[PDB]
Amino acid sequence: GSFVEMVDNLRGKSGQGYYVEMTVGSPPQTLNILVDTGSSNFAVGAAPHPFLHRYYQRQLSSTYRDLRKGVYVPYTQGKWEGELGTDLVSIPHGPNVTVRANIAAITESDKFFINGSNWEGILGLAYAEIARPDDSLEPFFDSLVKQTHVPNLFSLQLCGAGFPLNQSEVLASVGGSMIIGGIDHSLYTGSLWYTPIRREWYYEVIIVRVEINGQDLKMDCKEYNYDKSIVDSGTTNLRLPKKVFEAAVKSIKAASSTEKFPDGFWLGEQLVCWQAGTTPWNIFPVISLYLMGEVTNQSFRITILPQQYLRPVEDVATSQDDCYKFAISQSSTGTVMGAVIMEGFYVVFDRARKRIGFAVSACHVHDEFRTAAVEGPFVTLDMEDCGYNI
Ligand SMILES: CCCN(CCC)C(=O)c1cc(C)cc(C(=O)N[C@@H](Cc2cc(F)cc(F)c2)[C@H](O)[C@H]2C[C@@H](Oc3ccccc3)CN2)c1
């Protein structure tokens, strides 16, 4: 590992998001910021809110510049409205550089901030095409690269604990690493396999085959990417297009049929619990997603365990039982490879070479019998046809 200064700089968990510490303004104002590869705006709370114990105070920054323009971002989940401006930004546990970046000062929000998450803003790491108001508002990473010598690449290791973390624990625990400008080899095992970034807006990729315990889901691969497939640290679950979700759940139910679970569990709403240490991991299937490779007619696969798609949650009775929620749900906006999926791998966002790399994470949760995996190559034809076109 050659980036020790950035190793272990993240905190959080899949259900509330992973964040990195940043500073904005002069003198520096420290804020915790949600790492979101699923959007492209850098925005921070800039006014009191019930769930924030601190926020950006523009009047106290000598380097603050007002862009005299409003901005509104309606995400799938929540929304915020704010005022645009620029200011000096740094990442304490990151590259030792300071850059002038666009900042949306949030003045109003609805279902955006999360009670107890410990973050006060969001860092959209995707491309300008999806930035609000429009693509003229340069994203943070683009500014960082244009203004410094930092290589055009970042990598993420999100570390799920494998069990519930209470308020005190989640504040003291290391949640992972965000390596800005490089790849740290201590964060993964095995080889890195790369899939092309189909188009630069979201970090869009193409899934060409799906297996549940090795059994082909057997759908037209176009269905897997309808209307797109993205890698999104800003979403907890693996979200799947309606028809794919229905087929996946049917197959996962069949594989785990030795135990019956309530509909509320499969809807991702209610938790299921087992006596301490008795979670029957072995009855649940592994899930493999084959992604387009960099070489013609070649693909590779990433395999996740139920230790990834079953999200640890504290029992309503704070008992000693081990409980979880099903972290796979349906989408009407394409496949979303969220945090629970990223927790199994070290993910390299190689913007310079327009590709995304995957490798088994040194911190993924597993058991003595199975492990997550990244394997290849496989001969796969007409993969271009797996991509969707409106
Ligand atoms: C992460 C903590 C738990 N959580 C949020 C609270 C329930 C989710 O799992 C979740 C669930 C859904 C169904 C959507 C989004 C969602 O919209 N996430 C976006 C980021 C985000 C928004 C928010 F309000 C609170 C957050 F904690 C995180 C991300 O950019 C998604 C949205 C879409 O891309 C865009 C849509 C519109 C504009 C720009 C990007 C694909 N990436 C997030």
Swiss-Prot record:
What keywords were assigned to this record?
A: Acetylation, Aspartyl protease, Cell membrane, Cell projection, Cytoplasmic vesicle, Disulfide bond, Endoplasmic reticulum, Endosome, Glycoprotein, Golgi apparatus, Hydrolase, Isopeptide bond, Lipoprotein, Lysosome, Membrane, Palmitate, Phosphoprotein, Protease, Signal, Transmembrane, Transmembrane helix, Ubl conjugation, Zymogen
Recorded consequence of changing D227N:
Almost abolishes beta-cleaved soluble APP production
Gene Ontology MF terms in the entry: amyloid-beta binding; aspartic-type endopeptidase activity; beta-aspartyl-peptidase activity; endopeptidase activity; enzyme binding; peptidase activity; protein serine/threonine kinase binding
Spell out the disulfide connections: C159-C363, C221-C386, C273-C323
Catalytic reaction(s) noted = Broad endopeptidase specificity. Cleaves Glu-Val-Asn-Leu-|-Asp-Ala-Glu-Phe in the Swedish variant of Alzheimer's amyloid precursor protein
Provide the E.C. number(s) assigned to this enzyme.
Answer: 3.4.23.46
Q: Which GO terms describe its biological process?
A: amyloid fibril formation; amyloid precursor protein catabolic process; amyloid-beta formation; amyloid-beta metabolic process; cellular response to amyloid-beta; cellular response to copper ion; cellular response to manganese ion; detection of mechanical stimulus involved in sensory perception of pain
**Activity regulation per the record?**
Inhibited by RTN3 and RTN4.
Which Gene Ontology cellular component annotation is one that this UniProt entry carries? Answer: hippocampal mossy fiber to CA3 synapse
Localization per record? Cell membrane; Golgi apparatus, trans-Golgi network; Endoplasmic reticulum; Endosome
What is the protein name for this chain?
A: Beta-secretase 1
Organism, by scientific name, is Homo sapiens (Human)
Range of the intact protein held here: 58 to 447 of 501
